[PDB]
């Protein structure tokens, strides 16, 4: 068998993507039923980015100032309101291809698929993780604002991320679909910096279980460790603390492989103190921390969607 970074199958979302143009500024919107959701900075010009007073600028806009295009079909805007950092444009036709959907706010360490779009058209899909410092490591050019991240469960799409901005260190920041920013960021071209990032230990343990399941077992030692001693070592290498809840979440993988969690912890501790000595795991020379336990179970058990 095999192990690859896998994105959810798309299509349900692509039928929802539109172009929104306000004067010279253009970005992407999400068309669900008779409402289009888009970033509110679309109503700003290039000078406005320094210190935009959004209330003043939005009071001066009428319905006709918004040009919304779904491929060839122009949609008439008949109302608009602002919720936090997102605009909501009421349009006069409901989207016939609207899927079953939910809005969710994810926790750091969780993963999702991103559909990168430009000028209302999709360019590609890829998976990313929410880093402990509330950034993501994506791939986004000018024009990509309004692209969304999502998860699928059977038939229900959970939208969790709308893209807004790029930071100095080449990381990316955005909001949930209710318009609240992830992390301490603001939609302004000001000095902002990502904080110290940490490594998601539970994801590394999931990846080592994936490796064991795929037959890469050279790193298994014969020792065990205590939780407190492990976290003493982990803290020195800028790893997050392992909690008892995390230990319980790894239970199914442990049962599947017959390897207790604390043995994997001892093996990770040895990898951390001694390196990989030129060896690779799953084709990688670095430890990978962007697979949740659910991702591993899904890929190794082959869960499908209607």
């Amino acid at each position: 068998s095999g192990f690859r970074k896998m994105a959810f199958p798309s299509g349900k979302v692509e039928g929802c993507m539109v172009q929104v143009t306000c004067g010279t500024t253009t970005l992407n919107g999400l068309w669900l039923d008779d409402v289009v959701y888009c970033p509110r900075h679309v109503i700003c010009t290039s000078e406005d980015m320094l210190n935009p007073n959004y209330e003043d600028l939005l009071i001066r806009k009428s319905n006709h100032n918004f040009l919304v295009q779904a491929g060839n079909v122009q949609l008439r805007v008949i109302g608009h309101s602002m919720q936090n950092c997102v605009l909501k444009l009421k349009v006069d036709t409901a989207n016939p291809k609207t899927p079953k959907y939910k809005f969710v706010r994810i926790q750091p360490g969780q993963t999702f698929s991103v559909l990168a779009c430009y000028n209302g058209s999709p360019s590609g899909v890829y998976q990313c993780a929410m880093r402990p410092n509330f950034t993501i490591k994506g791939s986004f050019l000018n024009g990509s604002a309004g692209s969304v991240g999502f998860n699928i469960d059977y038939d229900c799409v959970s939208f969790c991320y709308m893209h807004h901005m790029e930071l100095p260190t080449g990381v990316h920041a955005g909001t949930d679909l209710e318009g609240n920013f992830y992390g301490p960021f603001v939609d302004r071209q000001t000095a902002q910096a990502a904080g110290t990032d940490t490594t998601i230990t539970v994801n590394v343990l999931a990846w080592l279980y994936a490796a064991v399941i795929n037959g890469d077992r050279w790193f298994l030692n014969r020792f065990t460790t205590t939780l407190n001693d492990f976290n003493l070592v982990a803290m020195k290498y800028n790893y997050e603390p392992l909690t008892q809840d995390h230990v319980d979440i790894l239970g199914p993988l442990s049962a599947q492989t017959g390897i207790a969690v604390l043995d994997m912890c001892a093996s990770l501790k040895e990898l951390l103190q001694n390196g990989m000595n030129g060896r690779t795991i799953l084709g990688s020379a670095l430890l990978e921390d962007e697979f949740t336990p659910f991702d591993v179970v899904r890929q190794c058990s082959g869960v499908t969607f209607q």
């Binding site: 143009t21 970005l27 000018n142 990509s144 807004h164 790029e166 930071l167 071209q189 000095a191 902002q192």
Partner: peptide
Amino acid sequence: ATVRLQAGNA
């Protein structure tokens, strides 16, 4: 280093 808001152009 200032942030770049990644909106496009018409």
